[PDB]
């Protein structure tokens, strides 16, 4: 289970999206190395120009590649679900704007980890920060707060993304997340804890298509009596 993540794992990502009736598709490819908590991914919009800012899709585009240090390994739901996989569902509510609803299945197909996503967005402002492409191409580091969901045999997560607005302040994106196993397990239900998540957005200087390169480092850390444990 964890055994499937000891080396470099190839990743494929597929997203079909519809935001305010603007329909689009994205294909992604890269690799994950959970030993170092490391992800390297490149995404191409296969339908032309992406109708939303690339940063707004980062969280939607594989937390099984997080580094769980020894004292945290009892709490790694994500790898425990593998290879059969899990369903990851989110509502992402953009402050004073629309919301995304996403449903993804994350699973192994042999040696390859596949993240396949459907996204529907509604209630966006055509001249707001999202459909109006007013967000900076960058990304703040954040903590992802995870809790068990015994009745669902899975987990929930809550966190807020701060997206820089061009010549402005921040666009908040409220994330509500639920993860449930696809198979019959067994799986690990964790104590409360968080993922410390660092993301870098890059461009491929030779790529003509609308695209995003993503480098991420993620490490799990504990929570004690409401206080985040620190490294």
């Amino acid at each position, epitope marked *: 289970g964890e055994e499937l993540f000891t080396g470099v794992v190839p990743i494929l990502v597929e997203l079909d999206g519809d935001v305010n009736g603007h329909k689009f598709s994205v294909s992604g490819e890269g690799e994950g190395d959970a030993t170092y908590g490391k992800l390297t991914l490149k995404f191409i919009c296969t339908t032309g120009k992406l109708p939303v800012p690339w940063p707004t899709l980062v969280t939607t585009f594989v937390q099984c590649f997080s580094r769980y240090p020894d004292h945290m390994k009892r709490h790694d739901f994500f790898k425990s679900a593998m290879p059969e*996989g899990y369903v990851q569902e989110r509502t992402i509510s953009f402050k004073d704007d629309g919301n995304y609803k996403t449903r993804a299945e994350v*699973k192994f*197909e042999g040696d390859t980890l596949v993240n396949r996503i459907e996204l529907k967005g509604i209630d966006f402002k055509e001249d707001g920060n999202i459909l109006g492409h007013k967000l900076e191409y960058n990304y703040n580091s954040h903590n992802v707060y995870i809790t068990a969901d015994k009745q669902k045999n899975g987990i929930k997560a809550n966190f807020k993304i701060r997206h820089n607005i061009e010549d402005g302040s921040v666009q908040l994106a409220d994330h509500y997340q639920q993860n449930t196993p696809i198979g019959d397990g067994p799986v690990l239900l964790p104590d409360n804890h968080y993922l410390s998540t660092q993301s870098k957005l890059l461009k491929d200087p030779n790529e003509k298509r609308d695209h995003m390169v993503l480098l991420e480092f993620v490490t799990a850390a504990g929570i004690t009596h409401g206080m985040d444990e620190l490294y």
Partner: nanobody
Amino acid sequence: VQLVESGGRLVQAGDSLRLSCAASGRTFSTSAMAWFRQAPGREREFVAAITWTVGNTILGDSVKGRFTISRDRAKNTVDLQMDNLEPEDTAVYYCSARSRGYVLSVLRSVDSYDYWGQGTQVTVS
């Protein structure tokens, strides 16, 4: 998900035959599809499997070099191309689908699938 196999007929030894299976319903989750067969009098036998996203294939020992599996993700079909057919290929051919992720080795087991078709009869004279 509903699986519907087609293409079975009576053919002569040495002929070719292509089977096809159509998956209907909420197919978003498909992770692999496979063909099995059961000749009356004998036990069910793995024939071929294909991984859904990349299309990696695996074959049963009895059909290597003669049978080819392929799939079309847009059409949600999986085909079995059978060349150099032999009387011992006479069987009902069943289509199966999995949604759970997997390591490749489990795809050869009849118990590794989430969905099963009705079968199509192939007879080889």
